[PDB]
Amino acid sequence: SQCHHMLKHLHNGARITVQMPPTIEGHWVSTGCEVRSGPEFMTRSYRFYNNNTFKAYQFYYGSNRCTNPTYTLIIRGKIRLRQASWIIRGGTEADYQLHGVQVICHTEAVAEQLSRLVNRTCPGFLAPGGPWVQDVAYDLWQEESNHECTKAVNFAMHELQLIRVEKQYPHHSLDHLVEELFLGDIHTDATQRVFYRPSSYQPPLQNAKNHNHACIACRIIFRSDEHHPPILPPKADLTIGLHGEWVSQRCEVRPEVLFLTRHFIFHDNNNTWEGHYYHYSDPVCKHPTFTIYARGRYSRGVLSSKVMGGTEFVFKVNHMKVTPMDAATASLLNVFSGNAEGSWQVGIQQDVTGCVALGIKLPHTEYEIFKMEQDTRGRYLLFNGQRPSDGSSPDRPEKRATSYQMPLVQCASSSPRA
Ligand SMILES: *[C@@H]1O[C@H](CO)[C@@H](O)[C@H](O)[C@H]1NC(C)=O
Ligand SMILES: *[C@@H]1O[C@H](CO)[C@@H](O)[C@H](O)[C@H]1NC(C)=O
Numbered sequence: 059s060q061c062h063h064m065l066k067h068l069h070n071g072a073r074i075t076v077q078m079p080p081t082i083e084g085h086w087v088s089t090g091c092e093v094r095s096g097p098e099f100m101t102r103s104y105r106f107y108n109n110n111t112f113k114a115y116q117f118y119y120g121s122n123r124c125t126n127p128t129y130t131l132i133i134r135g136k137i138r139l140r141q142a143s144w145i146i147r148g149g150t151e152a153d154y155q156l157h158g159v160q161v162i163c164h165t166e167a168v169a170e171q172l173s174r175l176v177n178r179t180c181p182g183f184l185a186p187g188g189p190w191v192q193d194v195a196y197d198l199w200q201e202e203s204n205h206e207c208t209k210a211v212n213f214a215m216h217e218l219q220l221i222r223v224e225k226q227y228p229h230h231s232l233d234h235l236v237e238e239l240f241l242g243d244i245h246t247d248a249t250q251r252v253f254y255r256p257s258s259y260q261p262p263l264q265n266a267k268n269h270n271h272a273c274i275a276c277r278i279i280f281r282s283d284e285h286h287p288p289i290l291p292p293k294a295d296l297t298i299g300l301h302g303e304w305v306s307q308r309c310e311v312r313p314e315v316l317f318l319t320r321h322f323i324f325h326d327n328n329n330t331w332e333g334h335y336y337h338y339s340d341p342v343c344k345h346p347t348f349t350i351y352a353r354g355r356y357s358r359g360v361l362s363s364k365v366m367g368g369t370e371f372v373f374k375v376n377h378m379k380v381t382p383m384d385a386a387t388a389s390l391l392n393v394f395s396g397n398a399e400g401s402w403q404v405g406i407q408q409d410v411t412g413c414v415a416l417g418i419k420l421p422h423t424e425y426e427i428f429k430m431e432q433d434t435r436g437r438y439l440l441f442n443g444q445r446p447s448d449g450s451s452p453d454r455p456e457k458r459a460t461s462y463q464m465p466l467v468q469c470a471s472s473s474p475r476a
């Protein structure tokens with residue numbers, strides 16, 4: 059359980075095989091309570107049938123534990139896989155056609171809030187007698203009626219345009235095949251969701267036939283429908299305890315920056331942090347491009363009022379070092395090094411932090427959102443804020459994320475257990 063060991067052997071040393079071309083035929087489910095920008099607390103139950111049609115459930119909830127359903131969307135349509143993405147290596151592009159979007163409200167309060175929101179968004183949309191009632195499917199989109207108000211709920215289905223299926227086995231075992239469907243990332247800005255071409259992935263869905271055996275949420279969701287939405291178990295909220303070391307569980311994908319792993323170190327004795335960002339050109343993180351080392355200070359935590367389960371931090375970067383890891387990276391940095399002798403070299407670390415290179419601004423302050431959970435094995439998971447989809451920095455409080463990146467796993471600690 060050394061940090062270096064877990065970075066050498068991502069996802070507990072699991073061997074990953076990529077279905078190329080991808081086979082999406084089957085039932086795929088969320089592995090927990092997902093957070094989309096907003097925030098939206100939701101689970102997915104997506105069925106892709108052999109005739110290339112799909113029925114997708116999006117179950118929405120009022121909290122980060124997904125114990126109290128609010129409304130469910132039932133999204134019907136047809137999907138056709140095109141070819142391997144040239145932008146996202148390991149990704150496969152696809153085209154889709156919506157046949158229908160229906161909404162069911164699971165409480166009176168939601169029926170009345172949602173009907174009001176549909177009316178404010180699309181004044182000419184609602185029927186005469188009064189507000190919507192619970193447990194009734196209302197049309198938000200019909201393929202043969204010409205009307206629609208999906209903008210009310212900030213709906214779009216562009217996630218179906220980028221597809222990756224990973225097959226996962228334990229390092230030395232042919233028992234426990236886990237199949238994961240990666241669909242396109244959801245834009246962090248709701249308004250931009252209608253025009254966004256995914257360049258990264260949502261958290262993976264797991265196949266109802268080949269899911270991790272410890273995935274409780276998987277089993278609950280598989281037995282659900284629009285009139286019985288998945289009720290997830292109420293896990294207790296953990297308090298943020300940063301002290302120690304955290305590493306990526308996977309070859310991560312960020313919008314516009316592609317593949318990377320992270321190694322973070324937190325010192326709670328003086329609120330100082332270090333980040334290593336190992337950047338790669340490939341989706342199994344074997345071919346390095348450049349490494350960023352960053353160091354600075356963080357604030358005390360304040361529980362978020364915007365995002366149930368989240369803790370607000372301010373993070374300041376005071377120091378930065380860059381290591382080009384291939385000749386192309388060193389070449390690009392040398393071409394864009396003015397007065398003098400930046401002398402960038404493969405594998406040689408240089409401090410950027412009296413002047414700065416590449417017009418990098420230091421110090422740099424970010425407004426962060428963190429949560430801590432446990433995996434099925436009782437290992438601690440650290441989530442920080444989803445990176446803005448447009449490549450921008452959360453550099454003002456109002457630009458703080460309302461959703462999370464994929465989690466880091468703790469690899470060093472000085473906290474007890476008994
Ligand atoms: C596609 O297949 C499913 C069977 O799982 C069926 O319910 C659905 O109606 C079929 N679609 C069409 C257009 O025939
Ligand atoms: C619907 O929205 C419009 C615009 O805000 C408002 O003027 C109207 O009164 C609303 N309708 C109802 C029935 O509340």
Ligand SMILES: *[C@@H]1O[C@H](CO)[C@@H](O)[C@H](O)[C@H]1NC(C)=O
Nearest residue numbers: 324325326327328329330331
């Ligand atoms: C903070 O504490 C860590 C761990 O002892 C130490 O390495 C680091 O130098 C300290 N930094 C400052 C600025 O005091």
